[PDB]
Write a protein that binds this DNA or RNA. Structure first.
Ligand code: FAD
Ligand code: FO1
Length: 502
DNA sequence: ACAGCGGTTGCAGGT
DNA sequence: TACCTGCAACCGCTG
C-alpha cells in the first residue's frame, strides 16, 4: 500500500545507457519496500495521424516490446503496454497507481514536444515530480544551439566545431535487479482483464500481414547489441570505414544496419560512439569525419540539431532551411515510383527492396531520392518522405526530412549539377546487376550490357530473354538524358527566386 | 565587399 | 588503380 515510480518508454527502448530508467531503479532500490515500479509503454493510437507506419515496422516494434519485457523480467520487473492516448491515460494512472515520480527520454519531434508539454503540465497539477533525461542523441540539440549563439549550425564542418567543445555524457550500464519488489496490485483495468497491459501480439499490432516481407532485421535491444558486436569485430573494417566506398547494391549489407535500432533507441548512440572511439585509439590508420563511421553517427546528431529549431522541418512551406521550389504534381509518375515500376531497373530494384525488406543502403536511398525530385520526375520530396515514412524500419522524422532536403538540394546540399544517373550509378559497384536480378526477377535473364537499360535491346532479343517491355516490364516513364538537363535549368531558376528575397 | 575555398557519396571521358 | 580535367555552376563560411 504505497506510491509508484514510473518510467515512460517512447524512444529509448533499452535497458543499457538509460539514465531515465536507471534513475527510477536506483531510487526504488535506495528505499526498498517503499515503492512500486511501472516501466510503461503507451501504445498511442494518435501517432497514426502523425506518421505512416507499414507492416514491417510494426513487426519490429512487436519484437522490440517483447524483448524489452524479457529484459525487464530478468530485473525482477516487467513491461506494461498501456493502450490509449497519453492525454487520456495519464490522469487515470496518476491517481490509480498513486505516482510520485515520472521519467522519460526527451525528443525534439513536434508530436512529442506538444505531448511532453501537456504531460508535464498535468504532472504539476497532480503533484507528480518529473525529471527528463537526454540520451537519444550524444549531444543535446538545445546546448549545441545555445553555444552557437542561439542558432543551429547549417553546415557540417561548423557543427563539428560546436560539438567537440562539449562534454560527452557518461554511458551507463544495466539497472539493478529490483530488491523486494512484488507485483503492483491490479488496477481498475487489470482487475477486469489480467492480461490488459501485456505485449501486443502480431495479430494485435500488424493489421496487414500480407505486406510483411522476410524478417531480416529482428527488433529488440538484444539484437542491436549482438549486431553491433558483430559489426565491431573487424576493427580494421571499422577504423578505415569510408561511406562513399560502401556499395549501395550489394546483396548483403555493406554497412552496419544499426539505424532501425538507433531510431527506436534499442541501441544507445552514446555507447556506439564510446565503442567506436576505443577502436580508433587502437587503430593508427583510421578514417576521419564526415566519411568515417563516427562521422555517420555525427550526421544523425547534425540533422537532430537543425530540426530541433524548425517545427516545419518536414515540409517546404514555413521551413527556414528549405529552398522554395515549384515542384509539379504527377500522380501517375508518383504511383510508379512508389511501387518500383518506373522502367529504370536500378530505381525499381531499390524501391522493391524498400517495400519488401524495409531497409535500403544510403546511396541506394540517394539514387531514388534524386530521381523522384530534382533528378528526373520533379516531384516534391514531401511525397517520397511519406513513402519512406511508411516503408523504412529506421524512419526518423529528422533524418528522413533532412536527407530528403539534401538530395532534392532544398537545404544543406546545393550543387544541383551533380545528378545521379539511374543507368550508370549502379554499374560501378554492381557491373553484373545481381541486385536488379534479385529484386526485379522479370529481367533476370537479361545480359549485363543492357540490364540497366532494357530499352536498348531489340524486341527479338526481349522475347529471347523471356521479358517483353510494356507487358512483363513497364516502359521507362521518363528519358533521363533529356529530363535531368531540363530540371537542372529549373533548379537554377528557382535558386535565383530564393536569392532575390534575401 | 566581393571573392576564394570547401562541400559525406555526379557523369563522361580520359590516363 | 585511383585519381586527371572538362561540364558551367550552386550554397555557407571566411578574412
Ligand atoms: C532520402 C533519405 C532518407 C533517409 N531517411 C533516414 C531515416 O529516416 N532514418 C535513418 O536512420 N536514416 C535515414 N537516411 C540516412 C541513411 O540512408 C541511413 O542512416 C543509413 O543508410 C542506414 O544504414 P546504416 O545503419 O548501416 O548506416 P551506417 O553506415 O552504419 O551509419 C551508422 C549510423 O549513422 C546514422 N547515419 C548514417 N548515415 C546518416 C545520414 N545520412 N544522416 C543521418 N544519420 C546517418 C545511422 O543511424 C546509422 O545507424 C536517409 C537517407 C536518405 C538519402
Ligand atoms: O509513445 C509511443 N510512440 C511510438 N512511436 C515511437 C516514436 O518514435 C516516439 O514516441 C517519438 O518520440 C514521437 O515523436 C512509434 C514510432 C514508430 O515509428 C512506429 C510505432 C510507434 C509507436 C509508438 C507508440 O505506441 N507509443
Amino acid at each position: 500500500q504505497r506510491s509508484t515510480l514510473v518510467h515512460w518508454f517512447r524512444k529509448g527502448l533499452r535497458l543499457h545507457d538509460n539514465p531515465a530508467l536507471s534513475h527510477i531503479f536506483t531510487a526504488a532500490n535506495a528505499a526498498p519496500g517503499r515503492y512500486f515500479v511501472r516501466p510503461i509503454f503507451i501504445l498511442d493510437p494518435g501517432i497514426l495521424d502523425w506518421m505512416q507506419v507499414g507492416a514491417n515496422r510494426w513487426r519490429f516494434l512487436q519484437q522490440t516490446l517483447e524483448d524489452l519485457d524479457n529484459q525487464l523480467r530478468k530485473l525482477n520487473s516487467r513491461l506494461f503496454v498501456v493502450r490509449g492516448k497519453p492525454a487520456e491515460v495519464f490522469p487515470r494512472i496518476f491517481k490509480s497507481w498513486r505516482v510520485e515520480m515520472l521519467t522519460f527520454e526527451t525528443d525534439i519531434e513536434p508530436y512529442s514536444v506538444t505531448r511532453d508539454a501537456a504531460v508535464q503540465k498535468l504532472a504539476k497539477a497532480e503533484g507528480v515530480r518529473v525529471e527528463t533525461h537526454c540520451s537519444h542523441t550524444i549531444y543535446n540539440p538545445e546546448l549545441v544551439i545555445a553555444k552557437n549563439l542561439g542558432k543551429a549550425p547549417i553546415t557540417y564542418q561548423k557543427f563539428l566545431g560546436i560539438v567537440e567543445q562539449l562534454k560527452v555524457p557518461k554511458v551507463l550500464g544495466v539497472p539493478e535487479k529490483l530488491k523486494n519488489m512484488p507485483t503492483p496490485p491490479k488496477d481498475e483495468v487489470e482487475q477486469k482483464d489480467s492480461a490488459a497491459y501485456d505485449c501486443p501480439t502480431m495479430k494485435q499490432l500488424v493489421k496487414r500481414p500480407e505486406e510483411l516481407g522476410p524478417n531480416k532485421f529482428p527488433g529488440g535491444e538484444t539484437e542491436a547489441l549482438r549486431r553491433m558486436e558483430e559489426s565491431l569485430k573487424d576493427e580494421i573494417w571499422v577504423a578505415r570505414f569510408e561511406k562513399p566506398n560502401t556499395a549501395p547494391n550489394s546483396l548483403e549489407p555493406s554497412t552496419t544496419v544499426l539505424s532501425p535500432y538507433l531510431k527506436f533507441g534499442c541501441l544507445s548512440a552514446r555507447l556506439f560512439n564510446q565503442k567506436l572511439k576505443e577502436i580508433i585509439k587502437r587503430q593508427p590508420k583510421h578514417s576521419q569525419p564526415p566519411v568515417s563511421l563516427i562521422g555517420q553517427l555525427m550526421w544523425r546528431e547534425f540533422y537532430y540539431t537543425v530540426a530541433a529549431a524548425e517545427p516545419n522541418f518536414d515540409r517546404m512551406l514555413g521551413n527556414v532551411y528549405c529552398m522554395q521550389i515549384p515542384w509539379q504534381e504527377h500522380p501517375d509518375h508518383l504511383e510508379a515510383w512508389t511501387h518500383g515500376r518506373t522502367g529504370y531497373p536500378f530505381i525499381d530494384a531499390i524501391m522493391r527492396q524498400l517495400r519488401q525488406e524495409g531497409w535500403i543502403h544510403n546511396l541506394a536511398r540517394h539514387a531514388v531520392a534524386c530521381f523522384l525530385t530534382r533528378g528526373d520526375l520533379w516531384i516534391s520530396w514531401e511525397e517520397g518522405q511519406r513513402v519512406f515514412e511508411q516503408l523504412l524500419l529506421d524512419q526518423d522524422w529528422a533524418l528522413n526530412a533532412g536527407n530528403w532536403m539534401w538530395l532534392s538540394a532544398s537545404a544543406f546540399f546545393h550543387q544541383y549539377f551533380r545528378v545521379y544517373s539511374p543507368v550508370a550509378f549502379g554499374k560501378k559497384t554492381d557491373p553484373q546487376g545481381h541486385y536488379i536480378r534479385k529484386y526485379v526477377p522479370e529481367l533476370s535473364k537479361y545480359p549485363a550490357g543492357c540490364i540497366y537499360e532494357p530499352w536498348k535491346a531489340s524486341l527479338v532479343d526481349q522475347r529471347a530473354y523471356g521479358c517483353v517491355l510494356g507487358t512483363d516490364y513497364p516502359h521507362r516513364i521518363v528519358k533521363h538524358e533529356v529530363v535531368h538537363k531540363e530540371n537542372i535549368k529549373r533548379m537554377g531558376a528557382a535558386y535565383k527566386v530564393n536569392r532575390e528575397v534575401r
